[PDB]
Design a protein around this nucleic acid. Sequence first.
RNA 1: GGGGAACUUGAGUGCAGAAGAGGAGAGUGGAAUUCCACGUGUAGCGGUGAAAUGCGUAGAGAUGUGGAGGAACACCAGUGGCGAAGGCGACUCUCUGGUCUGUAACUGACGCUGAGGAGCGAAAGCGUGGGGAGCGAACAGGAUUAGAUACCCUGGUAGUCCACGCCGUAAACGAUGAGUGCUAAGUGUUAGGGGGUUUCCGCCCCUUAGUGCUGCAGCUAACGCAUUAAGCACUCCGCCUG
Lengths: 131, 92, 218, 85, 64, 164
Amino acid sequence: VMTDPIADMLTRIRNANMVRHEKLEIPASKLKREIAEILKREGFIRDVEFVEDSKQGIIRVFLKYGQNNERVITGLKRISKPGLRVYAKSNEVPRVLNGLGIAIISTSQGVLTDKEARAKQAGGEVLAYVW
Amino acid sequence: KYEVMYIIRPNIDEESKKAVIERFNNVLTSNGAEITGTKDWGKRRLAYEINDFRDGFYQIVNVQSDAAAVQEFDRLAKISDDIIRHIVVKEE
Amino acid sequence: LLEAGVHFGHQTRRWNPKMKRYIFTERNGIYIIDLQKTVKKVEEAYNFTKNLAAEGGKILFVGTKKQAQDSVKEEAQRSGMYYVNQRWLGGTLTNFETIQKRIKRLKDIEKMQENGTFDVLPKKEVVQLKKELERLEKFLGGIKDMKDLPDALFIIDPRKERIAVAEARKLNIPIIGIVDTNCDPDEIDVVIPANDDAIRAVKLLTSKMADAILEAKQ
Amino acid sequence: TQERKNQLINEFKTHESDTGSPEVQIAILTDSINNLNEHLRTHKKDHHSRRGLLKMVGKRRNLLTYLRNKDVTRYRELINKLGLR
Amino acid sequence: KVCYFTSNGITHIDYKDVDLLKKFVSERGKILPRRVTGTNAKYQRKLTAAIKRARQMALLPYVS
Amino acid sequence: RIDPSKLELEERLVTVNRVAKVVKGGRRFRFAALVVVGDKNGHVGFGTGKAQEVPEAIRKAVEDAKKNLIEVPMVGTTIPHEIIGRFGAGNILLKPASEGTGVIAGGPVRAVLELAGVADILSKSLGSNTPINMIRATLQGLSELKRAEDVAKLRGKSVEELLG
RNA sequence: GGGGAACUUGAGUGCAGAAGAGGAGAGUGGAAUUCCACGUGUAGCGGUGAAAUGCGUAGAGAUGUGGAGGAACACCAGUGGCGAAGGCGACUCUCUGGUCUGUAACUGACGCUGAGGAGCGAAAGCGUGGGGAGCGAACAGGAUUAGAUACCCUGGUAGUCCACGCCGUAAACGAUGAGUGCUAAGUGUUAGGGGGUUUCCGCCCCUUAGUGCUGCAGCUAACGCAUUAAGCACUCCGCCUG
């Protein structure tokens, strides 16, 4: 019944950010695994690492809160919902929040985020904006 | 697995007492059932008047049955002019 | 002490989820790590109050608990600043100008009953005037010498005292004070975990406040 | 009670300890529908058992669609001997 | 506040034995509720069913 | 974080609002008015007051305005990024308009924006059209805007990789 | 998306248990009400704010026996339990549905939603045959009133009840569509399970599934809601545009 694992994980980490958890658990898959390492590269998150079991794995995230108890995370948004996919051309990649926002896009040359995707002229479905 | 409790009115000689309890046991054992236990209470003052008897005779018959003898026992007891009241209870 | 004075904690676990989430399970004192974190906390508050009082600011002392009110009152006396002992009347600091123009009446009438002409009607005014002194001084207490807004606070029970802590939060006073296990931390800048039932240790803990604020000046 | 289902599972025996086999499940389903059907015919207005009838028949038919999707051959050799359409 | 049946851990009622039902029925003939008996919840219903079959069997009276 | 009244601050009345009370003797008539204050560079507040007459009414409003201010970040005489206002059916869109476009706003939102001294901005009313809920929604908006350097600080990055 | 090979958490099957006014059919019991027969028994009963109409010397009401009959199941009973909803409380039996806990003994995504379609669906009503104790639209009389087709009194028909069809509607309400996951706590309560105490009496700590009340965060125009969201999100249906 749970339709989009990306949306599930996305609003789960949003919900933990809004309530100041340091601990958070996410049931594992390859797609959210590399979205985890992409977010680790972009530094919105302290650390992510994986442990495995008999049921598709399980991943955990350590989430940052800046220097003075403030939200490093100011919101998240899913776009490529199921039932209504969305695609954009390589030159039509949206500069979300005119630069300070970051968009994650599944492209024909793997999944990369907004700036290097624009730099290497990739394109595809815009998946999530983070503000 | 069914435990039976029925009342006959006291104004009965012991010749017919054994007669009625015996023929009801033959009814139960002839309708395919087997008697796993019998018990007796004898005399006991009723909680209330039923027809004109202040008193009554109490008897316990424990039978393991295949749910075929109890309905016919029910109709025999209720058509019998010597049994006042009776029930049948599933013991589980 | 680095040891427990009367630090046996709180009786009933009807309490506030804020910081007490995963502290080790030994007894009803589920937050037993307060024993070992209190010492570093009070020493940090100790050096902080040391340099702010060495700068020249003024602390004052608020508490209406039935067991600690006179204890902190006498502590305010021999430490040498202000206090509130009895009823925290509404909005003392956000009503500072009105409060001092009421305390001016107390100063004038106490100097009148000290050296002024006492009698113009030696019953009909003097008797309720003599009443009015202690009448205002009861709920007032140690408000006789502010002349200036104080720049810090210490509270024994911010649970009982919402009015003072909210007033300070509006008036950007840095609020310091101890925290009973039912209270709420993050609305207070520096919190010190302390059980309110410690009727004996409640004065020693702020005695460790008082010698710091005494040592800060000289 | 439970004797008919036990003989049905050990007759639709495929794997050594299978109870999760779809072919195993629809057999117990078929006997449930038939027991309830000759129940309903003597008790027509037992609507609260009509509902369970509808539940089990819907579960039966959509898991049959699953079995068709999985392998229609064993479906055919199930359907011919169990006898319904 | 004391539940009799858990107090000695007695199992199912065995309706033929009556003397406990005697002191669970009021002297005017009604069932004492849990406010005065203080039994466990899951036994009160089998109790009232037991005294009901006793009343049909005429060992315990409807009115007294 | 509170900015004192050490600065010079311009005031601008936006609305005097008639208010009434019904009492046993009849209707009783009172005056509320709200004003917006600030400087042309980065600090803005607003204030409300209630009194029986206009001048001390707006005086009460202007002391409350001197009490409450809020800073607005300003990246090149215009707002940095996208922001929608949000308070109680008050929805105000703010878009970082390009230079030389001037102020493009409705009445009260222009009244607060020009008193903020922002050169080029454009906006739209999407919520209700009562002025107090307007100003409250807009200052809730400009409260949310952040500079690039502190975001880079939260990132552990510099401003170049975030401007590009 | 399509195809191929995986896996077991989703969904399920087994095994071990538990609780229930769940349902259909049949039989049984008691308290009263009414009516009738008789014994005793005099002169009123009954009714309302006053009253009156009624019933009573042809013996009423009162009272005790003994019948007839139909109706609903006191106490239990609980913001308890069950059911999808309407709803379901006397007991006994036959048949039958469903829910929850443990278990991983088996399948390996079989799942969700659902236009049309199909089936259920309070009360009132309708059709045929029954049954008709009380109650009781219509209606009758007596009151009240300026008037009273009503409120009030005494009666009283259809119906209420049963069997079999039909109607398919209600404030059919949590004025909250269904499924899925996440998010501070406190306190009852139902039915289960586990650990230390003992495996007793009952204590404590967990534990699923409900079921109530509080209450953060968040949300709302406010009321308020708040792990049984009106929060955070996703899917699918239905619906609104003074």
